[PDB]
């Protein structure tokens, strides 16, 4: 069974998840938007 | 089994892989549309380029 | 006259437990073997077990006493709790309070007994089958440094506080403190020899593993039958290292290299640590008198300041 | 007779 | 600190891990 | 080269490299766009 | 010396905008230390925290030395190499060590 | 004197020379043993 | 089946022309021959050039430019950090740079040469992988970290006793280095590697010249620990552990000048988690 | 034959959902925007 | 055949429930919001 | 035979010796009795 | 065959006696209660 | 068989390219010419 | 049978000449004895 | 017998690509063009 | 084989190695002449022995 | 056949002579006794 | 069958003598007791 | 069966002589007793 | 083969080895002459024994 397709989709999903988490934390810790403020 | 998959990509995909690939591309398109809407709403809230 | 089936499936104290054996699948796929058990228990394996758990019991109960019998603080502070040897005001005396050094003394005595009986177990099980007693003497070379660290160096220095505490963070602290106390350990020459042998051991292990896995299509890893007649895999490994380095080894004496490179590490370490406090109280000053320290008159210290 | 380990067995 | 050069260097340090991972995956796949 | 396998391998490699560099680029563009500059000392 | 800058001690030093309730040893700076350790000011300087090559000293004294030394480099915002050449800790080749001797005497 | 102390020779340079010489000698004997004639499978048949 | 062969037949049987990387790129290897026992090729000439030039530059920087004939008193040092990533032939650190560059070429050449030989004997690629781990260690220490920091003066001096002063000063600038988690993983893997090497050597030596079967060692290793690994798995574990030891240590030294400044402060989060913060009293708070 | 087994997808989705729920709860609790377990 | 075994699901559910209960009890005890176990 | 007498003898003897040593250590550390004092 | 071995008991007894003698000598002589080898 | 022409072509091309790169780098780092300066 | 091969001798001589030229040029450039490639 | 035009085409293409990448990197990271910051 | 190699060097050289050897010796002579000229010019510029 | 080969002697002599020449040149240059390469 | 070989005796004696001679020479040189190679 | 081969004797003697010559030259040069290579 | 060698050195030399030996000894003699001249010139410049 070829290993190319499963590897590609797994690495794509991991990249997307990591990038989304990183961007969300960067935006949260900047204070530009109101979002979760005391 | 190589059926319903076009001959161009037969040396790569089966039929089950074809169905999974179709699901993946549909998910990608839906996510792209929702992301565009989200960015428009966030820009309307607070623009980040001035 | 050795019956391997009887040696593995006997009952009694001189027998095995964990029968019938088990099987782990991922170990079978990755490592090639998956059977776990049976395991021999004898007289020397029951004296090691009980003494090890006596010492462990003492250490963990003292941890709980220090924390205050609070399970949550026990979990929070587990990796920086320790049982320490008696302070320097006492000498090698055993008339020390329990919370100031008595527990350490008891637990260390029991650990000594456990390691000695484990050595005895290795020796006797090697003789029970048909194999030689080479793991036992390797463990003896390893135990030389252990007994210098915990018994002989404090004896020659005159206090128990020269010995490590019992904890996760306490061994790193002992390493730091002992290097700081006696000058600089980088200028200890038997420390240099020990590092030579440790890094060489890692080099050799990686090399041997890689070259045996690389030629495994021709069954070169069956090193028992290769020491009677060598086949294509061993020949290819020999040619590889001859065309790379200019010299090679055998399927026999490579493991001799392995044994001796691993053994010299502990022996040189024991000698260096024992000499560290008793004959040379300062290794940087000694290295300055021995002409092995570079001058360094105008350092560029901007690298080392934030 | 001559063997890899240095032993000469019959 | 540039923080853009440092990230590329970190990615090189991480991609240095790849051959060992491929070795483990090859061993798992080829031994069913 | 002639088979689809080699062409796919080449395209996958180039896509992965460009996606990695572009991901880092867009991350740092967003970061420097929204993050305020530190205040100078008194 | 004049190479440090010639700054003066005033009221805002030691107070930082508070009248009472001053905390010399906050809980934020006790990260790797027991939360009761205090600076050993009953000793004499230089010589109070010297451990190298001494046979009337053991690891208990080296630990007591290390607590103070980590307090120092948390208070400076620096590493150990601000006052030392780490290949020989007894050496006095960095001027900050003499500055620190004067400041230990002052405190 | 431009000379080291006697323990400099006893603790540093003699062990260094011993290590280098012992490595050379052990390598020589290992290679002599490994490249001799003993029982091997025939490369022509076995391959 | 087996007879006495004099090892000349063994070597003559396995010599073939042209299965290397240069033979696959250019169609022919320009240096496809043997000198003595060694195999020369492309990447064997490049490596030897690098070796000779590196040795000559090192000795010129040590004997001249420092005026010492003592090999243990030399400081082959990089430029100051005030120079940045600039190279200037009229400034003190220049020859260090040359030596460094030459060594890189040599090391990289060596790696590629191994691949060539692995292709000549139809082997796997395990030895190049295990060696590339430590080549990446050198590259991380001397190329990636100084570029991320911003100066060539962050690389290590190349003296026999003086490259250890760099280790001491770097280790105590980021105190406490023992508290670095990747450092602890690397030390654990080194100690485990030495233990495994001693165990394998003892095991194979204990069964060598004896009239026994190959199952005695399995029974021995199963009576003592309860598990015997096998013959392919001992050597696989050796390979993997040896490589991982340095792979994990690359991160520990890269993350020191970048992203971190203090390894005692790194753990400040542990006592502040909601599960157990605010549960003790006295010196048992936090 | 199949590109993905159903068991692996179920396991991965469950683990990811649990981890994300915990992460969001801790981030929101630590932010201080809501009262929650005060005093 | 069956993608999952009933025994595995039972074990996983029991372990997850026990860990969750302990975690929530610890968080609530350490918060200080409720009187509960006070000196 | 389910129970072996030798196992009982070995285990009981070892436990007795361990307990005797532990009690002696504890009583020596306590300092209540004069015993080996100065 | 034999439930108990004499050789094993002899070895164990000799080792135990040696260990006890060393421990008791060290404990007694380091207490400072006896006037032994005083400068 | 020996001194084949193709090998000489390959060696000459590689040597010329390497020497060109080396001389360009040396002349650029010497700082003697006003080329690619700020 | 000749002791040496001609091709290997040519290769070795060429390599030695190249290494020698590079070493001498780099040593002369940085010595500062000649007013050559000075900033 | 083992020579072909495909080899020369492939070699020249790869060489040109590598040189283009190197020249872009050298020119961009210099005193002039200042990483396009301007 | 060797038919235009001189009788003295028959056991050492081949028919093509002789030609390559002649090319090499002429290269070395030319390089030596150029090197001598270069050294004389450099000395006329700035002597390195004082 | 013969205890020594001519080729090995030639190779060893050449290597030793080259190394000695380079080392003596470096030492004599470092000594400072000759006005050889000075700015 | 001889217990020892003559070759081993010769080699051990030669090595031991050489090491002893070098050590004694270098110990006496750095003592300062004799004038010898004194600047 | 000879105890020693002539080839090993030659190699050992040659290496020993070269190493001794280098060592004695280094020691005599690093003493400062002779006006040799002084500036 | 072993026929141009003198009868004394037959057990050690071949024809080709004998020719290469002759070349090497002539080269060594020339190098020694040049080395003597170089040392004499260097001494006339600056004696190294004082
Ligand atoms: C190295 C670069 C190229 C190459 C570049 C050239 C160039 C350019 C020329 C040749 C020429 C020739 N090449 Mg071609 N040639 C190459 C590879 C080969 C190979 C091989 C086995 O691979 C062979 C057999 C040859 C063979 C040949 C001959 C067919 C032909 C005549 C040589 C001659 O007359 O001898 C005489 C041999 C000498 C070495 C003359 C000595 C001159 C030396 C080199 C001095 C340096 C030059 C200096 C600046 C000027 C003289 C200095 C003064 C004395 C002061 N080439 C490589 C691949 N070749 C020549 C020709 O006529 O083309 C058809 C010619 O001009
Ligand atoms: C103050 C110092 C003086 C100086 C004083 C001297 C003195 C004195 C001598 C030299 C000698 C030499 N000098 Mg000077 N030299 C100076 C500065 C320089 C500079 C420079 C850029 O400044 C350079 C490039 C040189 C270059 C040289 C070399 C041409 C030569 C070394 C020959 C050699 O390498 O033998 C080694 C070469 C080999 C090939 C190794 C083999 C040799 C062995 C020992 C014998 C085996 C031969 C072998 C078997 C034969 C087979 C054939 C071969 C394979 C070809 N000098 C300054 C100005 N120089 C030496 C000389 O003239 O030699 C002829 C010499 O005696
Ligand atoms: C508005 C404030 C910030 C900003 C904040 C954010 C944040 C926060 C995010 C982005 C993300 C994106 N931004 Mg933005 N972004 C900004 C400005 C920009 C600019 C610009 C030039 O100004 C550009 C080019 C972008 C570009 C991007 C893309 C890289 C990305 C949108 C693509 C995507 O996610 O769909 C791709 C579609 C898919 C990957 C399909 C997958 C989605 C499916 C639907 C699964 C969703 C998971 C779901 C919750 C699971 C539920 C399971 C069920 C319970 C069973 N941003 C400004 C500066 N940006 C997002 C990102 O990086 O995501 C990868 C992101 O999270
Ligand atoms: C600031 C820190 C100091 C430093 C201070 C010290 C001190 C102090 C010591 C060392 C020692 C060593 N150092 Mg150091 N060291 C420094 C920097 C380094 C560097 C480096 C790259 O910078 C390296 C590679 C090393 C490497 C080493 C090792 C070569 C050596 C110990 C190895 C060993 O054999 O342990 C293996 C350990 C053992 C064999 C004993 C313990 C295990 C035994 C076998 C018993 C275990 C059984 C157990 C109880 C059973 C229970 C387990 C059950 C299964 C549950 N150090 C700097 C200078 N180092 C030691 C040494 O040998 O000195 C010469 C030593 O004492
Ligand atoms: C009231 C004060 C706290 C609070 C403190 C707690 C504490 C403390 C606990 C919970 C638990 C729960 N809380 Mg609450 N909880 C709060 C606010 C909330 C909010 C909210 C929006 O504010 C939500 C959504 C929840 C939600 C929940 C659920 C996730 C959970 C109860 C259902 C469950 O799975 O267990 C029901 C259990 C089952 C379905 C399995 C049955 C178990 C049986 C009874 C076996 C028990 C073992 C028994 C003791 C042994 C004896 C056996 C005999 C010997 C035979 N809580 C506030 C902040 N919460 C519990 C939990 O996480 O459990 C997993 C828990 O321990
Ligand atoms: C800012 C100006 C910079 C400069 C920056 C650059 C940059 C950047 C580049 C050059 C390149 C060149 N420069 Mg310039 N260059 C400068 C100063 C100089 C000086 C001088 C004395 O000052 C000289 C002699 C040169 C000379 C050169 C040549 C080496 C080269 C000429 C391009 C070429 O050959 O076509 C090259 C193309 C062909 C021969 C045909 C290629 C075929 C197709 C049309 C190319 C498209 C491929 C594309 C990637 C799409 C791929 C297709 C798909 C994969 C299917 N430059 C100054 C300092 N220079 C280029 C180079 O290195 O190329 C090798 C290059 O990228
Ligand atoms: C003048 C200032 C310096 C000095 C700087 C240099 C520099 C710089 C160099 C030398 C080189 C030499 N110097 Mg000087 N040299 C000095 C003083 C000395 C003294 C002394 C006692 O004072 C001595 C003995 C020497 C001796 C030497 C020789 C070792 C050498 C020249 C002979 C040679 O090798 O043939 C000359 C070369 C050959 C016969 C090889 C043939 C070359 C052919 C022609 C190839 C040329 C490449 C060409 C461009 C490519 C082919 C064409 C393409 C197809 C287009 N120098 C002073 C101190 N010296 C050179 C060297 O080491 O060469 C190996 C060298 O580069
Ligand atoms: C950084 C690394 C970037 C490249 C990543 C390659 C990943 C795939 C490799 C692989 O795993 O390729 C799989 C192949 C073949 O597989 P096999 O031999 O297991 O088959 C066995 C059949 N019986 O092995 C290789 O190619 C080995 C590659 C050797 C080099 C790896 C280490 C060198 C790179 C590290 C950096 C060192 C400095 C480099 C120069 C600056
Ligand atoms: C560090 C050596 C200090 C300097 C410089 C100054 N003060 Fe201070 N002061 C210091 C301490 C440790 C304390 C006790 C704080 C506490 O929590 O009890 C004080 C206290 C005072 C007070 C009394 C505060 C009160 O009663 O509430 C006063 C009025 C005061 N200090 C004044 C003061 C002035 C005017 C200063 C500048 C000339 C000054 N202090 C400097 C430590 C230090
Ligand atoms: C300046 C604020 C310093 C910092 C940062 C560090 N140290 Fe230090 N050290 C400093 C002084 C002024 C002294 C003298 C103490 C005295 O009483 O005289 C010291 C001393 C030491 C010593 C002992 C020196 C000796 O002669 O034995 C050691 C071993 C030492 N210091 C270690 C050390 C470490 C490990 C540090 C990083 C945590 C460190 N020092 C920082 C001044 C300063
Ligand atoms: C792999 C690290 C330890 C985790 C063990 C449990 C993970 C799932 O382990 C499974 C095994 O249960 C299964 O038997 C083999 C194939 O036989 O495949 C593995 O993936
Ligand atoms: C049998 C093992 C060795 C026994 C050696 C005993 C060393 C005793 O050494 C002790 C010190 O440890 C003790 O502190 C003082 C008290 O004044 O008296 C000494 O005699
Ligand atoms: Ca604390
Ligand atoms: Mn093995």
Residue numbers in the entry:
A (entry chain 1), L (entry chain A), N (entry chain T), P (entry chain V): 4 to 41
B (entry chain 2), Q (entry chain S), U (entry chain Q): 6 to 55
C (entry chain M): 335 to 640
D (entry chain Z): 3 to 12
E (entry chain Y): 1 to 32
F (entry chain C): 13 to 54
G (entry chain C): 161 to 267
H (entry chain h): 12 to 58
From the paper:
To investigate the effect of Crts on assembly of the reaction center–light-harvesting (RC–LH) complex from the filamentous anoxygenic phototroph Roseiflexus (Rfl.) castenholzii, we generated carotenoidless (Crt-less) RC–LH complexes by growing cells in the presence of DPA. The overall structure of the DPA-induced Crt-less RC–LH complex was similar to the native complex (r.m.s.d. values of 0.866) except that it contained only five Crt molecules per complex and did not contain the TMx protein. The space occupied by group B Crts in the native complex was filled by lipids containing two fatty-acid chains in the Crt-less complex, and the total lipid content of the latter was much higher. In the Crt-less Rfl. castenholzii LH, five group A Crts were positioned near the second, fifth, seventh, 11th, and 14th αβ polypeptides. However, the absence in the Crt-less complex of all group B and most group A Crts had three major consequences. First, the pores in the LH complex that block quinone transport in the native LH were open. Second, the rigidity of the LH complex was compromised because of the missing structural contribution of Crts and the TMx protein, which is consistent with the result that a close interaction between Crts and LH1 proteins plays a key role in enhancing the thermal stability of Blastochloris tepida RC–LH1 complexes. And third, the Qy transitions of B880 and B805 molecules were affected, which could be seen as a blue shift of Qy absorption from 880 to 878 nm for B880 and from 805 to 800 nm for B805. In addition, since TMx was absent from the Crt-less LH, the Cyt-TM is slightly shifted. In the Crt-less LH complex where most Crts are absent, pores exist between adjacent LH subunits, and these likely allow for quinone exchange in a manner similar to that of the thermophilic purple bacterium Tch. tepidum.
pmcIn the process of photosynthesis, light energy is absorbed by light-harvesting (LH) complexes and transferred to the reaction center (RC), where charge separation initiates electron transport and subsequent formation of a proton motive force. Roseiflexus (Rfl.) castenholzii is a thermophilic filamentous anoxygenic phototroph (FAP) of the family Chloroflexaceae. The Rfl. castenholzii RC complex consists of three large subunits (RC-L, RC-M, and RC-Cyt) and locates to the center of the LH ring, and the relatively low r.m.s.d. value observed between the earlier structure and our higher resolution structure was 2.449 Å. The Rfl. castenholzii LH complex consists of 15 pairs of αβ heterodimers forming an open elliptical ring with a gap at the 16th position, which is occupied by the insertion of the N-terminal TM helix of the Cyt-subunit (Cyt-TM) and flanked by the TMx protein on the outside.
